Design a binder for these strands. Structure first.
Lengths: 57, 221, 99, 25, 141
RNA sequence: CUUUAAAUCCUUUAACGAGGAUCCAUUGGAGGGCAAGUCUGGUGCCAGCAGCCGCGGUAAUUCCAGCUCCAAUAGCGUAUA
RNA sequence: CGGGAAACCAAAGUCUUUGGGUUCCGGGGGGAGUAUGGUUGCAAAGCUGAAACUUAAAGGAAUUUGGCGAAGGGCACCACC
């Protein structure tokens, strides 16, 4: 606890999780090429409702 | 999955002695079977759900809620419809709204902007629909303009086959039911406008009932 | 149930006059009159009466406003007075729930 | 309060204010 | 339109002039009282010196302690209160220090559940709060 | 080499000049308006988010961090007329 | 007939198919018919009439469970005589 007026407590007592070494994302023209391929090339005919691009069910 | 037509119009349609629904629209006959249209308009008749607005009626204990579903249907080179149904759950509300939308589809005519070359693309006149407080006005546009409007009359106008139009709405258009019924009234009032393009005195042909009544009395009671 | 104590910035106080608009002034045990505040967990669940022992939080940048944490009942206030966290001259005046 | 007696109260307050200003010469 | 005549233009112009004067948003920008009563003086940002760190409280539905600061201006000496925007930035501000003060974004009105505030702090001691939050700049001493 | 008062800048042109081509693309946001996780940990009407509705009460799709995704792109966010 | 958000209206109709003539008057709620100035009156008071500040609502029409120390009909020894 400490006090009700402790400033910045939740920023200061949360756990520190380090970053992850990830691959360089290509930016510019080929990113639009990847977006076009993933949207309008690899589409499969489904039924009902299409899940979102971040649908982590 | 079998059609048993209750009206004589459905039996005349099913026995394949009528040509199109255009004569049905010419004689202004009431249509009370939803899938006569499904017999006529095939895979070109597509529907999209507009809004599902939940309503509530308070009771002895708590509020009894119900869902009202709006859907618009129509082929992309002609007729267009709109149907409303409210029921307990969502699926039967959508099914009933689709049935009522197929039941009431109206024809459209399209005009030209200045030069009459090729196929028509725009509204022939300055039609106006009115329901509630929503005031929807449709104005002809030159070729290649596109439907510039709110999204709901935009999708209704691409569904209705009109390619180029100028719109100007007024009132509380946030209510989607009044907005959709007002633009449907604006579209449906297109044939109900006398222009000098059709001032010639019409010819009255025979009704389907009096010309196929021999078939009706030979088939049914 | 438990006996929570003070901390390095948390002290004790006694209510002097009940105040409106969800606030009160309480007499701290340092000679300083402090305008306290009712905690949002105490706005309807439990009530604070005049002349009761409560736990109060403080600000490290000003001493004009404060905030109440919890409230002590009669037996635990007497037990904490017997231990020595409270001064002996502080009159608890037998705050209790009547019948 | 209703508007009539509020207007009467504000009339009385205005009369007291006018008297105080005219006696504060 | 009511007065619809061929040589009726000064009547229409004068009537629309008085009815345009009889407004709120247009009248606020065409009278000097609103600009003089504004502590910014028609300016977008302003500077000031911190006097003390205060704590104000939220309204009826939500309950928290929104932490602000009392700043007196440079240009005129009016005394305002300003809300420190982000989490834990009250350590970055000490008394008698220069701050750059901007509005919330509702044109001199209170925003959210904080009563009586119209200003917020962007920079302190001529360095931004975002760089201090993200560990990108340090406070000089 | 060219330019120019003389340079510098651009263009031409020798020699060197990249593989995880570390020669590393940021700014906002992910409940609705409004494009995009009912993911995983920490606090528990406190800290804070939130232009507006509203979100936090010891299972937070809105806080604080990690992964993924979304909008524009050498640009993006905020305040005032 | 027609109009309107509806209650309703033969005018509150002939209005996105928007223009017969003409006067007064309102731009979310509070502050506030308030302060000051002028003016009128013996007086009480009348006419003209702000701003600072504060708020996301204040409002209009209508339908079912809400309660009436509202009315009209029926029922109960967990009501009464």
């Amino acid at each position: 606890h400490g006090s009700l007026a402790r400033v910045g407590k939740v920023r200061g007592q949360t756990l520190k999780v380090a970053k992850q070494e990830k691959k360089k994302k290509r930016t510019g023209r080929a990113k639009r090429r990847m977006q076009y391929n993933r949207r309008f090339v690899n589409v499969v005919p489904t039924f009902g409702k299409k899940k979102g691009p971040n649908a982590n069910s | 999955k079998e059609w048993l037509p209750v009206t004589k119009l459905g039996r005349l349609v099913k026995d394949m002695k009528i040509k199109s629904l255009e004569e049905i629209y010419l004689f202004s006959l009431p249509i009370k079977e939803s899938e006569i249209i499904d017999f006529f308009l095939g895979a070109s008749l597509k529907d999209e759900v507009l809004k599902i607005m939940p309503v509530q009626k308070q009771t002895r204990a708590g509020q009894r809620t119900r869902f009202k579903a709006f859907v618009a249907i129509g082929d992309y080179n002609g007729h267009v419809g709109l149907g409303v149904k409210c029921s307990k759950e969502v699926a039967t509300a959508i099914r009933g709204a689709i049935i009522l939308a197929k039941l009431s589809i109206v024809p459209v005519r399209r005009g030209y902007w200045g030069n009459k070359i090729g196929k028509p693309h725009t509204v022939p006149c300055k039609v106006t629909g009115r329901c509630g407080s929503v005031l929807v006005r449709l104005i002809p546009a030159p070729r290649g303009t596109g439907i510039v409007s709110a999204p709901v009359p935009k999708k209704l106008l691409m569904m209705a086959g009109i390619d180029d139009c100028y719109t100007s709405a007024r009132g509380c258009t946030a209510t989607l039911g009044n907005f959709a019924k007002a633009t449907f009234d604006a579209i449906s009032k297109t044939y109900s406008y006398l222009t000098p393009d059709l001032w010639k005195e019409t010819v009255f042909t025979k009704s389907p009932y009096q010309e196929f009544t021999d078939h009706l009395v030979k088939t049914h009671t | 149930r438990e006996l929570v104590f003070k901390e390095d910035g948390q002290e004790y106080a006694q209510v002097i006059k009940m105040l409106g608009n969800g606030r009160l002034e309480a007499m701290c045990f340092d000679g300083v009159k402090r305008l306290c505040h009712i905690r949002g967990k105490l706005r309807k669940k439990v009530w604070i009466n005049t002349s009761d022992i409560i736990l109060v939080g403080l600000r490290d940048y000003q001493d004009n406003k404060a905030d109440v944490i919890l409230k002590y009942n009669a037996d635990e206030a007497r037990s904490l007075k017997a231990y020595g966290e409270l001064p002996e001259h502080a009159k608890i005046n037998e705050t209790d729930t009547f019948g | 309060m209703r508007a009539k007696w509020r207007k009467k109260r504000m009339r009385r307050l205005k009369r007291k204010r006018r008297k105080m200003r005219q006696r504060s010469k | 339109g009511k007065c619809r005549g061929l040589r009726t233009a000064r009547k229409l112009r004068s009537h629309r002039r008085d009815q345009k004067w009889h407004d709120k948003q247009y009248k606020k920008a065409h009278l000097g009282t609103a600009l003089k009563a504004n502590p910014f003086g028609g300016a977008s940002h302003a500077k000031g010196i911190v006097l003390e760190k205060v704590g104000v409280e939220a309204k009826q539905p939500n309950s928290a302690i929104r932490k602000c600061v009392r700043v007196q201006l440079i240009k005129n000496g009016k005394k305002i209160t300003a809300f420190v925007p982000n989490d834990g930035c009250l350590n970055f501000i000490e008394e008698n220090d220069e701050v750059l003060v901007a509005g919330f974004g509702r044109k001199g009105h209170a925003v959210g559940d904080i009563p009586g505030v119209r200003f917020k702090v962007v920079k302190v001691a001529n360095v931004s709060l975002l760089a201090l939050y993200k560990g990108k700049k340090e406070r000089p001493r």
